[PDB]
């Protein structure tokens, strides 16, 4: 499940879908030949590099837009924290016992400190990869 | 005519629709009470300040997204440059004799230098405001 993002709203560090994989963009360039944009990114799950060029479209006369796809993040409540995993619950009560937390920008520690102070309103943002789920950021409500 | 942009892809300097007006965002904050984002922007045409808070939606369980609207930019060919205006043509051959160029980041000079060297492939990106059109950026093909 994905959203369309115009290329002028894509900056380094964004998470895009490259070659069907969730990736963190580390380099943006432009093709001289076509004017497409080329995004080099790091697979959030495998840590391999993927590249993909933007999709050009013409929905109307005088309207050219380049887009990439970005993931739809799910929001889960945090019920408990174990060794490197968490117990999450979807907002329909579906419990996920060992959701992994990505090692990126000390997410575990930020999350721990926020769970200590106020567990009721900690949320994790979660990406899916062909079934595998992983938490990649946090929010507070 | 507008596109939906997720709030995590909105940074200072982006052009958003605030209160129905095209604006350049100069400050982003978050409401404690609701978690919406609040965007303070400068009307591209009047130079007045407008603010507007994000729209929250729930398209699916465990999926919360905040969005703002952004304009759809049209792309026009540049046929000639006058005193502060340009002659543009849409890609269906509709000629616009005095399209104004916004004074923002020396757009006129960047545009002039690019029109001197290679007029065939200079384009302007144009926003509409209830009929009034204005060029706000340039591209080269």
From Swiss-Prot, chains A, B:
Q: Which GO terms describe its cellular component?
A: cell septum; Woronin body
Q: What is this protein called?
A: Woronin body major protein
Q: What does this protein do?
A: Major component of Woronin bodies, fungal-specific organelles that occlude septal pores in order to separate intact from damaged compartments. Hex-1 binds directly or indirectly to the Woronin body tether that in turn is anchored at the rim of the septal pore.
Outcome after substituting residue 9 to G: Abolishes the ability to self-assemble
Which part of the entire protein is covered?
31 to 171 of 176
- Mutating residue 113 to A has which effect? Does not affect self-assembly
> Which superkingdom, per the lineage?
Eukaryota
What is stated as this protein's family in its record? Belongs to the eIF-5A family. Hex1 subfamily.
Q: Which GO terms describe its molecular function?
A: ribosome binding; RNA binding; translation elongation factor activity
Compartments it resides in: Cell septum
Q: Which GO terms describe its biological process?
A: positive regulation of translational elongation; positive regulation of translational termination; translational elongation
Give the taxonomic lineage as stored in the record: Eukaryota, Fungi, Dikarya, Ascomycota, Pezizomycotina
Q: Which gene encodes it?
A: hex-1
UniProt note: phenotype after gene disruption: Impairs plugging of septal pores and leads to the loss of cytoplasm in hyphae severed by lightly drawing a scalpel blade.
Give the multimer and partner information: Forms oligomers. Self-assembles into hexagonal rods.
Q: Which organism is it from?
A: Neurospora crassa (strain ATCC 24698 / 74-OR23-1A / CBS 708.71 / DSM 1257 / FGSC 987)
């Amino acid at each position: 499940q994905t959203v369309t993002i115009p290329c002028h709203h894509i900056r380094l560090g964004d998470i895009l879908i490259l070659q069907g994989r969730p990736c963190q963009v580390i380099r943006i360039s432009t093709s001289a030949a076509t004017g497409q944009h080329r995004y080099l990114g790091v697979d959030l799950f495998t840590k391999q590099l993927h590249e993909e060029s933007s999709f050009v479209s013409n929905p109307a006369p005088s309207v050219v837009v380049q887009t990439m796809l970005g993931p739809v993040f799910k929001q889960y409540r945090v019920l408990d924290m174990q060794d490197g995993s968490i117990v999450a619950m979807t907002e329909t009560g579906d419990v996920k016992q060992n959701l992994p937390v990505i090692d990126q920008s000390s997410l575990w520690n930020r999350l721990q400190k926020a769970f200590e102070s106020g567990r009721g309103s900690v949320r994790v943002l979660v990406v899916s990869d062909h079934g595998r789920e992983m938490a990649v950021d946090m929010k507070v409500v």
